[PDB]
Design an enzyme around this catalytic site. Sequence first.
Site, short mmCIF file in Angstrom:
data_model
loop_
_atom_site.label_atom_id
_atom_site.label_comp_id
_atom_site.label_asym_id
_atom_site.label_seq_id
_atom_site.Cartn_x
_atom_site.Cartn_y
_atom_site.Cartn_z
N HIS A 1 -55.04 20.01 -31.07
CA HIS A 1 -55.06 18.54 -31.06
C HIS A 1 -56.12 17.99 -30.14
O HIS A 1 -56.38 18.57 -29.09
CB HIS A 1 -53.74 17.97 -30.57
N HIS B 1 -56.25 15.16 -27.54
CA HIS B 1 -55.37 14.33 -26.69
C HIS B 1 -56.17 13.15 -26.15
O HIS B 1 -57.40 13.22 -26.12
CB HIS B 1 -54.75 15.20 -25.61
N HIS C 1 -51.23 12.86 -27.88
CA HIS C 1 -52.21 12.99 -28.97
C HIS C 1 -53.02 11.70 -29.06
O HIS C 1 -52.47 10.59 -28.89
CB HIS C 1 -51.55 13.26 -30.32
N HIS D 1 -47.06 11.35 -35.81
CA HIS D 1 -47.67 12.69 -35.87
C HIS D 1 -47.61 13.24 -37.29
O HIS D 1 -46.58 13.08 -37.96
CB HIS D 1 -46.97 13.62 -34.89
N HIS E 1 -51.82 11.15 -36.42
CA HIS E 1 -52.68 10.71 -35.31
C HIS E 1 -54.12 11.11 -35.63
O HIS E 1 -54.34 12.15 -36.27
CB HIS E 1 -52.24 11.42 -34.04
N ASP F 1 -54.81 14.78 -34.75
CA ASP F 1 -53.96 15.81 -35.37
C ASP F 1 -54.81 16.77 -36.20
O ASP F 1 -55.02 16.49 -37.39
CB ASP F 1 -52.85 15.19 -36.22
N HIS G 1 -52.28 24.80 -28.19
CA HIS G 1 -50.87 24.83 -27.76
C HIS G 1 -50.24 26.22 -27.92
O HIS G 1 -50.75 27.08 -28.65
CB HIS G 1 -50.09 23.77 -28.53
N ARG H 1 -49.39 23.52 -23.19
CA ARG H 1 -50.85 23.48 -23.36
C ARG H 1 -51.43 24.76 -22.77
O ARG H 1 -51.38 24.91 -21.54
CB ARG H 1 -51.36 22.22 -22.67
ZN LIG Z 1 -50.14 14.13 -33.25
#
Ligand SMILES: [Zn+2]
Lengths: 153, 152
Positions: A46, A48, A63, A71, A80, A83, A120, A143
């Site tokens: 992702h 962020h 995100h 999401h 997002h 994403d 992640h 993370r």
């Molecule tokens: Zn997301």
Amino acid sequence: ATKAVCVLKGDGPVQGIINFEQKESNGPVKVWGSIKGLTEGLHGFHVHEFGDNTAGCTSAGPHFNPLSRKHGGPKDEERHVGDLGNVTADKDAVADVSIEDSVISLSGDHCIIGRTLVVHEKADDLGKGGNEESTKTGNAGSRLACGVIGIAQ
Amino acid sequence: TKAVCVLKGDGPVQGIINFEQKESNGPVKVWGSIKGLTEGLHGFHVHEFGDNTAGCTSAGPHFNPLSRKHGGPKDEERHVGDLGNVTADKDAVADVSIEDSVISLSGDHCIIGRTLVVHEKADDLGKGGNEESTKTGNAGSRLACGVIGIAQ
Ligand SMILES: [Zn+2]
Ligand SMILES: *[Se]c1ccccc1C(=O)Nc1ccccc1
Ligand SMILES: *[Se]c1ccccc1C(=O)Nc1ccccc1
Ligand SMILES: [Zn+2]
């Protein structure tokens, strides 16, 4: 063309280099590179919101979601901007990353330069999971590695 | 608008630098701390690329969108990236407190997504007695760097 780059660093070592290239501002972004030190399987991937690594990857916040959506996966309309789904590590602990995305940009309101790319602990369920957190984080867990997305030559 | 930069490198030098700009036509406040520095001046610059692929070398030259010569922050003739020097005491700590009217967190002078670098040696602010003075300020190697990111 606009180009960006991100060095992912985290404990393992989870270490990665991710390149971004956009031929036109109205065009898709190609995302490619490698991440080593990953457990075999899917890892949520992702952008962020903050390019803030003051206290590690946690400082990057949620995100990147400039359009205030839920999401989802990269192929979903409801997602997002940040994403980018999952990257896949084989038993070699290496993820070879090869993404093309039409929602992220290297220009405009959807621009990801100066934000944080994160890989992640767990799979992103792409918002199809059986709980509330699915629609926010995709349940991708901690993370492992991150970096700020910078302008490249 | 707020930005932030975590400075890391191969050696003892590490830092945190914050940027704040109240209006787009306004100065940028730059503040934070860098530790592990030798006593004296250390060149402090925004470099062109937010690229740390092979460490601080990948950041390229001083951020210079207007094709000027190297100078100090209070000079007209300067790179956008030219933030002069930070000063370390015998404690090996530089407390950073800068206000700059040329860098921005908006527009063509924007430094977000570029690299902040703290150098081995003093920047001579282009007043040195050689050709390199007008390009790099003779500030020597890159001790620590980071990409400038958008902050909360
Ligand atoms: Zn997301
Ligand atoms: Se690109 C990029 C990278 C970092 C910070 C800002 C931008 C950008 O394009 N900003 C912007 C333009 C238009 C609307 C919102 C934001
Ligand atoms: Se700010 C910033 C930081 C990195 C890259 C681009 C920008 C930026 O905002 N540029 C720009 C985008 C849109 C409109 C004007 C200027
Ligand atoms: Zn310079």
